[PDB]
Amino acid sequence: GGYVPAVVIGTGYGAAVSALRLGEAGVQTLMLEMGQLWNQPGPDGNIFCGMLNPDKRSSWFKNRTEAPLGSFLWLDVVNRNIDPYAGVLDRVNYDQMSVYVGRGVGGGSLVNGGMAVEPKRSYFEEILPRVDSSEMYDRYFPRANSMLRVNHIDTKWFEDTEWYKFARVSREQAGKAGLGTVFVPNVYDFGYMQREAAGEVPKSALATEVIYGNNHGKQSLDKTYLAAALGTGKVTIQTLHQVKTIRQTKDGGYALTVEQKDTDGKLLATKEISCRYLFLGAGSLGSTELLVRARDTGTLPNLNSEVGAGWGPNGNIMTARANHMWNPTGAHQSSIPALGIDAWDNSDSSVWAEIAPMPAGLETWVSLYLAITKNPQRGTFVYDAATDRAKLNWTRDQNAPAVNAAKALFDRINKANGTIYRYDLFGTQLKAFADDFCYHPLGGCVLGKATDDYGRVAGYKNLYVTDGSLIPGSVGVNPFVTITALAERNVERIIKQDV
Ligand SMILES: Cc1cc2nc3c(=O)[nH]c(=O)nc-3n(C[C@H](O)[C@H](O)[C@H](O)COP(=O)(O)OP(=O)(O)OC[C@H]3O[C@@H](n4cnc5c(N)ncnc54)[C@H](O)[C@@H]3O)c2cc1C
């Protein structure tokens, strides 16, 4: 423990942008990450386990592996009991919602599908009217794409390869309903993916890896922003260090209590770390819990009532259609999506749907979709002092508008093609729409509500939030490009005016 000029909590998108720019500005910066640095070959010689061979590396402190959502019917057979371990993917269970987040250096960039998508400017303008959309679209979004290593699939290869048959089938089906598809830019190197298919390089996307990490191809933040931040000479990263409490010191600045653990979860030390500038990049869940805890235990008593509010799951809904026998989706499906259905017009019927691959590795005729919808419902994180946890006050009926929007779009597709939903992919009960999970948690510390328009926490100086907690519950697309671009805007301004 001791003093560092700047501390960044977490190592996801908001954190990584912040630390790079701080380091470039000459500010010595310590990043504290509760998960691991994923660079140690494991028992199979790989850093990460695949989706057909999950082991303790797959899961943050659970005692059994779980099938990727949509896949239980085919992948429960590979599940096994495991030791609780500092694995890469954390299913965080709240009363009526399960939020999936990455744990490690790089955060959700380790486990996500790589999809780098800019929101519709008119929707950005609706959700954040206090922000200048011009600089976002002409400066920050381009900067983020370049630093993230966003790239584009070759359309000829896409059209030919067996690995994207699943995507072409849904494109054809959607077309019969008058719905168009879009190619989705990615941080997975598509050139690498071609060479995987050709047998020239080790497979990752083409070997059923994504949600527990990619051993190859995916340019997660440890390779992009965080590598650059380390390269400044002004940034260091301490792992298996979880920030528990934040206080304003009597002499200025912030002090943190930080627990260091081993990979089995044993407590090794509790350290006090202080700083001048404190940046929260612990995610929608993590940053919001730190601040509700600090307000409600009296260590940051001047936090406002908007801390904790305004959470939403980005309208996330999963659903699946049963194809006709003559439309097999293939046994070989790249684990990186390449196409979406863009039916998003900012109205309440809007849907942006990823055409999602399935990992079963045999023909199932199923088409899987992750829908992103416009649902005004929000939840609130409240502090439970008894257990020292933020609890998310969301109820499953709050996803009814999301279900309704997703169903209306997929009903069109089913009507045009004479197909039906699958009802058995998410559990025993007939359920065509998974409505109590989230991959894209947004809000809790909303920009302009809990913070100023650059993420400065209201009530405090030199205290910043940088991450998905800033976004008001919805962006209409996969969120990380927006988190990244918004973090570029925010840290630039903070450094210029405050540092
Ligand atoms: C299965 C899945 C698929 C997804 N697919 C996509 C996709 O293709 N495209 C897209 O745009 N988005 C996708 N997402 C969402 C995207 O990954 C997240 O929106 C993004 O990672 C959020 O960034 P963040 O900076 O807010 O936080 P995170 O990336 O979640 O990072 C927070 C970091 O802080 C650490 N941390 C938390 N609390 C503490 C603490 N108290 N002390 C220390 N460290 C702490 C965490 O361990 C983590 O490393 C996906 C996510 C999942 C789970």
Spatial distance between the Cα atoms of 179 and 409, rounded to a whole number of angstroms: 9
Nearest ligand 1 atom to the CA of 487 is 25
243 assigned binding-site residue? yes
Q: Evaluate: CB of 379 within 6 angstroms of ligand 1.
A: no
Residue with tokens 């000479």: 233
Q: Evaluate: CB of 483 within 6 angstroms of ligand 1.
A: yes
Spatial distance between the Cα atoms of 322 and 320, rounded to a whole number of angstroms: 7
Statement to judge: residues 144 and 3 lie in one domain: yes
- Please name every residue paired with 260 in a beta bridge, in sequence order, or none if there are none: 241, 269
Which tokens is 204 given? 């990752």
Statement to judge: residues 82 and 221 lie in one domain: yes
468 assigned binding-site residue? yes
Task: Write out the catalytic residue numbers.
Answer: 354, 440
Spatial distance between the Cα atoms of 469 and 486, rounded to a whole number of angstroms: 12
Q: DSSP strand E in 249-350: where?
A: 254-261, 267-280, 317-322, 339-343
Spatial distance between the Cα atoms of 145 and 198, rounded to a whole number of angstroms: 28
162 assigned binding-site residue? no
CA of 11 to the centre of ligand 1 (A): 9
Statement to judge: residues 264 and 202 lie in one domain: no
33 assigned binding-site residue? yes
Tell me the DSSP string of 12-73.
SHHHHHHHHHHHHTT--EEEE-SS-------TTSSSS--SSS--GGGBBS-SB--PPTT-HH
Determine contact, residues 370/318, Cβ cutoff 8 Å.
yes
CA of 170 to the centre of ligand 1 (A): 28
Strands 97-102 and 89-94: antiparallel
Q: Evaluate: CB of 102 within 6 angstroms of ligand 1.
A: yes
Nearest CA, atom 2, ligand 1: 112
Spatial distance between the Cα atoms of 244 and 311, rounded to a whole number of angstroms: 21
Statement to judge: residues 155 and 304 lie in one domain: no
Task: Return the best residue to mutate from 439, 471, 483 for the ligand 1 pocket (most ligand atoms within 8 A of CB).
Answer: 439
Statement to judge: residues 284 and 160 lie in one domain: no
The total of other beta-carbon atoms located within 10 Å of residue 298's CB is: 8
The total of other beta-carbon atoms located within 10 Å of residue 326's CB is: 6
Task: Return the best residue to mutate from 34, 110, 388 for the ligand 1 pocket (most ligand atoms within 8 A of CB).
Answer: 34
Q: Domain count for the chain, please give it.
A: 2
Name residue 119's amino acid: P
Statement to judge: residues 239 and 119 lie in one domain: yes
Provide the domain limits for residue 227.
1-148+211-315+378-394+436-498
Nearest CA, atom 17, ligand 1: 108
Determine contact, residues 328/363, Cβ cutoff 8 Å.
yes
Statement to judge: residues 383 and 352 lie in one domain: no
**Which CATH number is 196's domain given?**
3.30.410.10
**Which CATH number is 230's domain given?**
3.50.50.60
Statement to judge: residues 113 and 3 lie in one domain: yes
494: helix, strand or coil: helix
Tell me the DSSP string of 259-273.
EEE-TT--EEEEEEE
444 assigned binding-site residue? no
CA of 87 to the centre of ligand 1 (A): 14
Name residue 188's amino acid: Y
Q: Evaluate: CB of 437 within 6 angstroms of ligand 1.
A: no
Contacts of 469 (CB under 8 A, 6+ apart): 280, 283, 284, 287, 288, 442, 443, 444, 445, 446
Strands 235-238 and 29-32: parallel
Spatial distance between the Cα atoms of 388 and 118, rounded to a whole number of angstroms: 37
Statement to judge: residues 278 and 170 lie in one domain: no
CA of 324 to the centre of ligand 1 (A): 37
Q: Evaluate: CB of 260 within 6 angstroms of ligand 1.
A: no
| Continuous H helices in 177-316 | 190-197, 225-231, 283-296
Spatial distance between the Cα atoms of 278 and 6, rounded to a whole number of angstroms: 6
Determine contact, residues 401/373, Cβ cutoff 8 Å.
yes
Spatial distance between the Cα atoms of 61 and 310, rounded to a whole number of angstroms: 28
Statement to judge: residues 298 and 411 lie in one domain: no
Which tokens is 34 given? 């509760």
Cited resolution, angstroms = 0.9
Nearest CA, atom 14, ligand 1: 112
- Phi then psi for residue 401, to 5 deg, are -60, -35
Statement to judge: residues 165 and 307 lie in one domain: no
CA of 25 to the centre of ligand 1 (A): 25
Statement to judge: residues 74 and 97 lie in one domain: yes
Nearest CA, atom 41, ligand 1: 243
Say if residue 362 is exposed, middle or buried (CB neighbours under 10 Å; 0-12, 13-18, 19+).
exposed
